[PDB]
Design a binder for this molecule. Structure first.
Ligand SMILES: CC(C)(COP(=O)(O)OP(=O)(O)OC[C@H]1O[C@@H](n2cnc3c(N)ncnc32)[C@H](O)[C@@H]1OP(=O)(O)O)[C@@H](O)C(=O)NCCC(=O)NCCS
Ligand SMILES: CC(C)(COP(=O)(O)OP(=O)(O)OC[C@H]1O[C@@H](n2cnc3c(N)ncnc32)[C@H](O)[C@@H]1OP(=O)(O)O)[C@@H](O)C(=O)NCCC(=O)NCCS
Ligand SMILES: CC(C)(COP(=O)(O)OP(=O)(O)OC[C@H]1O[C@@H](n2cnc3c(N)ncnc32)[C@H](O)[C@@H]1OP(=O)(O)O)[C@@H](O)C(=O)NCCC(=O)NCCS
Ligand SMILES: CC(C)(COP(=O)(O)OP(=O)(O)OC[C@H]1O[C@@H](n2cnc3c(N)ncnc32)[C@H](O)[C@@H]1OP(=O)(O)O)[C@@H](O)C(=O)NCCC(=O)NCCS
Ligand SMILES: CN[C@@H]1[C@@H](O)[C@@H](O[C@@H]2[C@@H](O)[C@H](O[C@H]3O[C@H]([C@@H](C)NC)CC[C@H]3N)[C@@H](N)C[C@H]2N)OC[C@]1(C)O
Ligand SMILES: CN[C@@H]1[C@@H](O)[C@@H](O[C@@H]2[C@@H](O)[C@H](O[C@H]3O[C@H]([C@@H](C)NC)CC[C@H]3N)[C@@H](N)C[C@H]2N)OC[C@]1(C)O
Ligand SMILES: CN[C@@H]1[C@@H](O)[C@@H](O[C@@H]2[C@@H](O)[C@H](O[C@H]3O[C@H]([C@@H](C)NC)CC[C@H]3N)[C@@H](N)C[C@H]2N)OC[C@]1(C)O
Ligand SMILES: CN[C@@H]1[C@@H](O)[C@@H](O[C@@H]2[C@@H](O)[C@H](O[C@H]3O[C@H]([C@@H](C)NC)CC[C@H]3N)[C@@H](N)C[C@H]2N)OC[C@]1(C)O
Lengths: 260, 261, 261, 261
């Protein structure tokens, strides 16, 4: 029997999902196993556990972001500058490796989407506009980000069969932590400004590689080992539920003690 | 018989105030009528309806801002440049005509205050720091303002016995609207920079008069007439509750249809 | 006896016109008096004094720009939107009040014309393409204007029997000057885009009236009184020759000292 | 015994330097040998050969540009962002490796300086304002640069005992050439905006290393070998005089023939 909407709602509640929470989801559809109605039901069951007074957010990004054009031959780069479409939040597809669930949520009714193309977040619920508002283009995991706001309202992160290395919130901890050196990247990106395409330069800390000798899975496993978070099964998937404030505090101290 | 805290909470909730909302208040204490405990209880009852997870914001400004000194004779202007105190957010009193409630909220525990002297906003609650942060000195009702942020996080405006022409949010609608004519002003203002008094020039759209043949009362009454917002009684006061996003959208379209491209 | 080409060249050189200069001209044909060969000879004599390594520029504008249509009733405005021709730089006639000499220069061999319809400049000579390039539609007397470039390359302004209140360069001084009050306008204009007529909205500082209590004649006469420029006769005309950089610097200071920060 | 002004003027003239030319100089003071009056006389002799109708330009840059701060520990970078002064064209010292002569010319009477900090050019003479005007911050050796204008006005480049690898004009040829790949750099820089320090991001082609398997000395040697330019002695220094137009054309074709796509 495929997992039902009711059984998923109940499993989310048993894990500790409560009405009114703000929750960021990382997921693997395959890890959950067959669901009666497909991945829509995962999202709807989670929303139902949160109720309309809660909020569900996912990292969408932009699957087709042309941030690599400086590596191309000059003639090809010029074609990209002329012909590549800009980031349009109405149509820009979510990064496939962020789970199809992120693309499902991006196209959900009443969804709100943040403006930073590379770091774009999507959310549905009471605080969806708040979480996604005024997402700065530079340092998209920093102070002016949905991650900062998730911490401020004491939200949560749910890992639903997703590897612990994929906790996007830890990029916000990297931003906050006083470390000896962080790598800064500057890359071009087309956006919409006054309804017209404009290429801008985006500045950020490197999010493709760590700034020192560490991994996100290492931080998260250390957090779990010292009693952090709650663990349970949802469908066939191993699930972890973390408080964003405590995990961020732990991760900053973890990074500063080792690399500060 | 003075209105009680409990009855004000009930009246706010009946109007549509809910836990977690971000709310900008315009008020008249006299319109509410006698409250048991005074105007403090109006603020506390509203904060209780919003809960600590909600936010209450008011326009404080600066009662003593010397933005008029260019109109004075040179000798008097010289004294102002030498002797007028700078905007200190810890002490700068709220504009009296913004209601004594704005000054009451400005001095409330855990308050946050925005840095733009003329346009300074004060807020208490979960999003108080967010709303008041990085308030640019130029164009204080524009893109880098608490009003823009209130719209972005889909907050609300509550008129508590206040006239409809006192909706400060409509100055943000003026900023957004593409209009045939706008007045731009530059005026001096003393501020604190690294703990020292410095005189800077602030540039803004004129907020002392409309940019064309309209009034804020016209826009607000037209909004209400077409079903915008909710109306109800709080104490003795007529109250209006507006969604900031919907009101701003309406006002921008209202201005652009009459004076736009 | 009409003034000859040779005598006009000599008069221009005596005034201080030199080979290689970039020169913006304001003129009255009547003030110069009868010229042997007509106004063509005024332009050719000036170009000869400048040599091909110099540049001559005039403000052409567009005599038929329909920037007033927002004031019309909707039915009449609709006809203008459908039927009024767009700004075509090949055919758009210069503003008649800018002197027929501006229209003469607009249709001169090897002329370059800037793209801003209301503020369009025409130029012939070594720096004609440079001066007229990339003239932005918004703020046509501002940073992206031929007037800004004339200042930047330290060109000159020649008043050839033209009243001192017609110095278009002073609109660039207004743009630069930090003043207590500025009027910003938006107006419609049809242009060519990919060979098709398109209506756009242009934003600019108001150039129909000053932004404060001053006149262009007032500024220029003050400049002359303190030793600015050189004066002389060209034909029958009173002539003034100003350095664009020094006049702009003076005018910005003049405006800011009276209406500035 | 030390070289005199009169002999240096003649030596420059013998090379082909003529009245009215626009000339960019690269130099080694040591290569010229002892001059009666010091390096000032090198500059003055060159200006005299060019006459006041000519123009002399050098690449000054900024000796203290902090374009390296991303390589520093984060705590040190924060100090630079707070404490490092901005590029002030009045005081920013020329890059020492650009010759002390560039710093001498930067502080010469009637000098003009372009606004791009890393690529800043200084010039004295009739077209000094033109050459240094509107120098874009991004792609400072490209279309909106003093090198583009030097080509447009048919200027010249003089190597005065300077290595052929130091021909800055060839960075403009790199910009123009359709090459298979060019390296783009983006770096921070403090500048002045409204009299205040502001950190901006500057984008440019890498000028610290070639974009492919070539050197500027290689290009220049090939140019000389096929008859380009003139060569002679000025003091003790080997000198080369190149036409900017022809050298740029040659260098673009050279780069596209070997490294184009
Ligand atoms: C990479 C990762 C997503 C892969 O997990 P996955 O379960 O294999 O992939 P998804 O979650 O996208 O689900 C894919 C399945 O959805 C199924 N599915 C059901 N209905 C579908 C529909 N209408 N359309 C598309 N797919 C559908 C498909 O069967 C698909 O499997 P298939 O394409 O192999 O046939 C996962 O390991 C992971 O890392 N998740 C966390 C990702 C994250 O949050 N990253 C943040 C940035 S580090
Ligand atoms: C102008 C306006 C404030 C006048 O309304 P009001 O009720 O008369 O004035 P206030 O709201 O400031 O309340 C004043 C009353 O508070 C009472 N009060 C109670 N406790 C008080 C205390 N400790 N200290 C001072 N006053 C106190 C006083 O009785 C005072 O009345 P009084 O001074 O005449 O004796 C109102 O009409 C209005 O426009 N409100 C909206 C204002 C706004 O938000 N403007 C935004 C910019 S357009
Ligand atoms: C308004 C102003 C141009 C009037 O001066 P003016 O000498 O009477 O007018 P013009 O310079 O255009 O010369 C007109 C004369 O050129 C003569 N002319 C000679 N050949 C001509 C020809 N082929 N075609 C048309 N006119 C010719 C005509 O006699 C004509 O006079 P007329 O039409 O009355 O018969 C002058 O006072 C002025 O202000 N000049 C500065 C304008 C300016 O630069 N403004 C900038 C924007 S503020
Ligand atoms: C690097 C290079 C400048 C070195 O040449 P150089 O002759 O040794 O150095 P300079 O031209 O700066 O002249 C320095 C000499 O000026 C002399 N001098 C005379 N008066 C002087 C004065 N008031 N102040 C300072 N130096 C003075 C000094 O003797 C000094 O030598 P010293 O400091 O060792 O005692 C030269 O090889 C070169 O490359 N020139 C071209 C540079 C260029 O244009 N680069 C463009 C960017 S690639
Ligand atoms: C497409 N351009 C990407 C850019 O978007 C950027 O995306 C990173 C993205 O690469 C990064 O994912 C990394 O982390 C994932 C997880 C296993 N942590 C190691 C797997 C993919 C791996 N690249 C995300 N955690 C954060 C996201 N901002 O990374 C650098 C880049 C290659 O230029
Ligand atoms: C007593 N008659 C009042 C009338 O004065 C009226 O005055 C205030 C009026 O005083 C107030 O104006 C102030 O605000 C203007 C602007 C500069 N605020 C930033 C400039 C004038 C300044 N006095 C308006 N913003 C709001 C308006 N309601 O209020 C209602 C009323 C009952 O009609
Ligand atoms: C008021 N005195 C008149 C006047 O018409 C005057 O004409 C023009 C005057 O007409 C002209 O203004 C016209 O042009 C303005 C607009 C077309 N751009 C500036 C709007 C007002 C309009 N009258 C001014 N820019 C310059 C002025 N010299 O000439 C002197 C005179 C004939 O005595
Ligand atoms: C201070 N930052 C510099 C930057 O300004 C920039 O400097 C280059 C500079 O590196 C380059 O000069 C190099 O080539 C010359 C070499 C061939 N000597 C004969 C002079 C010394 C050497 N620095 C100049 N031709 C152009 C100049 N823009 O690039 C390198 C850099 C390290 O990022």
């Amino acid at each position: 029997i495929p997992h039902t909407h009711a059984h998923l709602v109940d499993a989310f509640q048993a894990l500790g999902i409560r009405a009114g929470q703000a929750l960021m989801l990382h997921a693997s559809v395959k890890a959950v196993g067959a669901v009666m109605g497909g991945p829509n039901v995962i999202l709807q069951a989670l929303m139902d556990a949160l109720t309309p007074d809660g909020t569900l957010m996912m990292y969408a990004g932009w699957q087709d972001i042309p941030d690599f054009i400086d590596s191309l031959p000059d003639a090809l780069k010029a074609v990209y500058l002329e012909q590549h479409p800009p980031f349009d939040p109405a149509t820009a597809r979510a990064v496939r490796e962020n789970s199809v669930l992120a693309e499902f949520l991006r196209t959900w009714p009443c969804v709100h989407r943040s403006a930073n193309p590379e770091a774009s977040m999507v959310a549905v619920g009471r605080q969806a506009a708040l979480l996604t508002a005024n997402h700065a283009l530079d340092y998209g995991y920093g102070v002016e980000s949905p991650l900062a706001k998730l911490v401020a309202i004491e939200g949560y992160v749910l890992m639903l069969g997703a590897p612990l290395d994929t906790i996007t919130l830890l990029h916000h901890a990297e931003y906050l932590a006083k470390m000896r050196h962080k790598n800064v990247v500057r890359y071009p990106c087309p956006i919409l400004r006054d309804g017209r395409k404009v290429w801008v330069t985006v500045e950020d800390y490197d999010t493709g590689d760590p700034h020192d000798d560490y991994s996100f899975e290492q931080i998260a496993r250390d957090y779990v080992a010292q009693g952090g978070g709650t663990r349970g099964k949802v469908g066939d998937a191993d699930a972890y539920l973390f408080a964003a404030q405590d995990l961020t505090r732990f991760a900053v101290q973890w990074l500063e003690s080792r690399f500060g």
